[PDB]
Amino acid sequence: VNIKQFLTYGRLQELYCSVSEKNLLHTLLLKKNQERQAQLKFRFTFHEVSKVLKDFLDDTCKGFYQKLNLPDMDRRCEHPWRDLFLWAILQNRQEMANYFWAMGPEAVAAALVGCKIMKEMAHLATEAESARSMKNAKYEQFAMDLFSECYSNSEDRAYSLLVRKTCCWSKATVLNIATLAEAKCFFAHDGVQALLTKVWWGAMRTDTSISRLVLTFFIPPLVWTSLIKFNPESATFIRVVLRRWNRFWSAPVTVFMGNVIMYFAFLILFSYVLLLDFRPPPPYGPSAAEIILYFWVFTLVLEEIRQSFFTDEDMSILKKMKLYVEDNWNKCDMVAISLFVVGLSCRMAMSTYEAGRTVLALDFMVFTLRLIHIFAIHKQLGPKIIIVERMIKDVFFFLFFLSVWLIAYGVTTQALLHPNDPRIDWVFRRALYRPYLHIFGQIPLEEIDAAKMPDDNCTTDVQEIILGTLPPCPNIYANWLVILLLVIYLLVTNVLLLNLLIAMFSYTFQVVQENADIFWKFQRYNLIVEYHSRPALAPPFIIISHITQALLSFIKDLLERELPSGLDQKLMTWETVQKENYLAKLEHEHRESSGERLRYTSSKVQTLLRMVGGFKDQEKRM
Amino acid sequence: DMSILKKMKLYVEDNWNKCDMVAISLFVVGLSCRMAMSTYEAGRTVLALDFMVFTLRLIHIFAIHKQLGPKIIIVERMIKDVFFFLFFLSVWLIAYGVTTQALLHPNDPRIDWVFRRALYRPYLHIFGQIPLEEIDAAKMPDDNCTTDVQEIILGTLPPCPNIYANWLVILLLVIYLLVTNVLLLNLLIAMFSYTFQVVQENADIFWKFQRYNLIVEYHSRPALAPPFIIISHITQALLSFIKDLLERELPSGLDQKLMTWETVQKENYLAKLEHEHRESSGERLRYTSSKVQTLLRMVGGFKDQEKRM
């Protein structure tokens, strides 16, 4: 049976029409069919499956069947194995789909697409058994194992396989599909991380020492010295030195360190303006350093806008806005800039000058917190950031417990000790602020214990208490109860709750660390991709780069590269050969397993026993 | 026999030798400054630092101890987690301290006090030192304070803290205390626990490897501890001018006997490895399957022959 000639577009549509009518794919196709009928032979048309694929992948499945709207039914499919694998995957048939994957030309991309579809369908699954089967698709494992085989074979063709534009998946890079599938375990692979490191260092050698690198960075002229090695490949000499300068300063790592250094400078300038050069309203004028700070923040905003919006030429503005606001750190950035503009506006006035100063003071803290996000790419610190973001949950659990206990204790002691204090602010103080401070060793016995209460000049009149003329006289009716409650609260909080928090942190750290490393690698991919397109000049200078880019656009990628036809075909055949070798190795290792050897031995012993019994009967006859 | 530059590089390679060089440099600088009268206090301060350096060298001295050496290795490993926590705490502390200094003393020109209230106080909040007397308006004493910048700079009167929006300052203090004294400290504790569990076994091996070198080092060391050691040095120099249990050289017969004995032991060890591999469950299963296949085909042929007759 020749799949190339057997599988035509009409036959593929017939296969899609004859679904089991009891699985998810049939329900999705029915919903799409109803939508199409409401908008306006064969039960389901290629429009329905195209819309389902748009729900699942939304970028990869473009032009699979809409290009000719439907193609000729008598025309054979251009990518038969791709369509069969996709079809078998949409209906949770894993054995048939695995077989189709084993025969397809491009297997890493197919496996990543499969794992994406399975993790998308696991949410839509109705039966628990089907959902469990989908959650254990292990298609990402297929891609990881096959790429491990490919990387072990060549390690140079593997990078091209990673960054080539796949023909069967609408010119989508394998890394693009892995990003779409959120295959975190795939990005954690050694080969992908090695390629990302190669991109990270740019033209420089990946083994360049950090000390030598920063030493070269701080004194620019040492770039032309042989202090740092470079990967291979009068006017000519000028061209040579210019190329060396560009190759060093266009590297993502140098861009990142320039951004870090100038962000430190930005924070230092912000603090200086806030603490030493914050002048009266514009009637007396903001300081020159304040104007410089305003321009610096403006350039930071321009860079953020360009990064969020002008990197993708084709995408809905609302979709990009939703994607931008999806991130919590982008929410923090929006909060920072909103605080900056509010503080600037209030500072321009005179009746809201102090409010503007306070808002700017808060904004400094927000930016200093953004510094963590900035260092997220660091190899030693990133996993720690992930781990802390995980421990926040245990922090909240402890917060709930402590809050309940603190409400109880604080309200009880406030009632027992100051029952005649009308001031709401002081009620909240003595009820929540003081019990919170008892956690950190701040136990003011001077107003909880009668033997330690000083002979201050205190009153009991409510009118005098409210006016603040004299401090309220604390009630010492039953102060043994107050002291006992303080002892119990101190015991509970400072021992049970704190040690429980410590134990929860220990257990969570042990459970999380391994997944945190993988998540850091997956995040590092996106951050490096993000630094690839970033202009080489850190703000406030970045305005020069923005102006140059805008002027070039008005007048007129190492990753995700497109290869010639011959090289692409050679790489596809090489990947197919590696897949065949990997499957053969799996089959051989299964055949030499202890269990399979025992099964074969038992079967052959049974056959030998019956044959020997027959032979012995025949021999005994003669 | 070794290059002087090579020996110097090997010596400066060690961090503890760097500490020793720092100690002696501080000693000579302090002695020179103490000989003077205009730098007497500087020399005293440098010698005070040098005492701390020597007391720290005492750890290196006890490195050979069997109970303590692994602990020294483990601590040297935990330094990395200390630095991670230091980075996190430093970022958070810069943010909180600068924000509170801006919110609370916006009119204090003194740079020293700016750095104090921005970094020294927030650092001390970690260790239970929370001076609410100057962060909370209800707890600020009625001290005789001024707002004039000229008077503030001269130090005549303490600056009057700003209480414009002090609820924000108290809330920020509460959040900072929570974060630092709970999340960061317990995260450091958890990191230490995990690192201890991971490291202890390798730390023991590293201690043994270091112990070898330290014992070799004590083999050649003169038996007289300093300041007496000068007698040993003078005696050694005089003996050199006038004129090893480990690394011993053996007679030819004994050396040949030991080589043959080692070869015999190697042969026995390889034979034991081969025997243990041959008696393994997997190899037994493989041999059984192969012999069963051969027996099955042979029995099929024999059964066909018997059925013929």
Ligand SMILES: C[C@@H]1CC[C@@]2(OC1)O[C@H]1C[C@H]3[C@@H]4CC=C5C[C@@H](OCC[C@H](CO)CO[C@@H]6O[C@H](CO)[C@@H](O[C@H]7O[C@H](CO)[C@@H](O)[C@H](O)[C@H]7O)[C@H](O)[C@H]6O)CC[C@]5(C)[C@H]4CC[C@]3(C)[C@H]1[C@@H]2C
């Ligand atoms: C292992 C575990 C640890 C926790 C705990 O269980 C065990 O320990 C238990 C111990 C217990 C406590 C044991 C003892 C007591 C004392 C008792 O008062 C007895 C009554 C007498 C009288 O009526 C009160 O006294 C007097 O009050 C006066 C106030 O008008 C003071 O006048 C002051 O007025 C002004 C104040 O500046 C100044 O002029 C002078 O300073 C001074 O003139 C006197 O000086 C003082 O003498 C109250 C209860 C208390 C605190 C116990 C509480 C519970 C414990 C902590 C247990 C734990 C579970």
Ligand SMILES: C[C@@H]1CC[C@@]2(OC1)O[C@H]1C[C@H]3[C@@H]4CC=C5C[C@@H](OCC[C@H](CO)CO[C@@H]6O[C@H](CO)[C@@H](O[C@H]7O[C@H](CO)[C@@H](O)[C@H](O)[C@H]7O)[C@H](O)[C@H]6O)CC[C@]5(C)[C@H]4CC[C@]3(C)[C@H]1[C@@H]2C
């Ligand atoms: C479970 C969790 C724990 C943490 C937290 O969340 C929950 O707790 C919350 C509780 C909350 C706090 C609740 C209450 C308040 C009070 C509020 O002020 C109300 C406004 C009033 C008025 O405008 C200010 O008051 C008055 O100021 C004056 C200053 O001029 C004082 O004059 C003093 O002047 C001199 C000072 O020596 C001397 O002459 C005398 O000493 C005295 O005359 C008055 O005596 C005092 O009455 C500010 C906010 C604050 C502190 C909250 C902060 C946030 C919390 C800690 C929450 C946590 C997240």
Ligand SMILES: C[C@@H]1CC[C@@]2(OC1)O[C@H]1C[C@H]3[C@@H]4CC=C5C[C@@H](O)CC[C@]5(C)[C@H]4CC[C@]3(C)[C@H]1[C@@H]2C
């Ligand atoms: C962690 C929660 C946050 C929210 C909250 O409870 C803890 O904070 C508390 C702070 C309280 C303030 C503190 C001071 C004053 C000044 C006083 O003249 C009038 C009452 C008022 C505004 C109080 C109203 C009730 C408030 C917001 C409480 C509120 C439930």
Ligand SMILES: C[C@@H]1CC[C@@]2(OC1)O[C@H]1C[C@H]3[C@@H]4CC=C5C[C@@H](O)CC[C@]5(C)[C@H]4CC[C@]3(C)[C@H]1[C@@H]2C
């Ligand atoms: C952990 C880092 C170490 C380095 C550093 O920041 C923390 O230490 C801080 C101590 C500061 C000092 C403290 C006191 C004074 C006295 C004053 O009349 C003039 C300014 C000066 C010298 C300050 C200059 C800036 C200094 C070194 C800061 C410096 C960034």
Ligand SMILES: *[C@@H]1O[C@H](CO)[C@@H](O)[C@H](O)[C@H]1NC(C)=O
């Ligand atoms: C307390 O205040 C009143 C106000 O008149 C005063 O008469 C009395 O002497 C004061 N006592 C002390 C010790 O402050």
Ligand SMILES: *[C@@H]1O[C@H](CO)[C@@H](O)[C@H](O)[C@H]1NC(C)=O
């Ligand atoms: C504060 O200092 C000034 C200086 O003249 C003085 O007049 C005033 O009485 C002082 N007040 C207090 C309570 O120290």
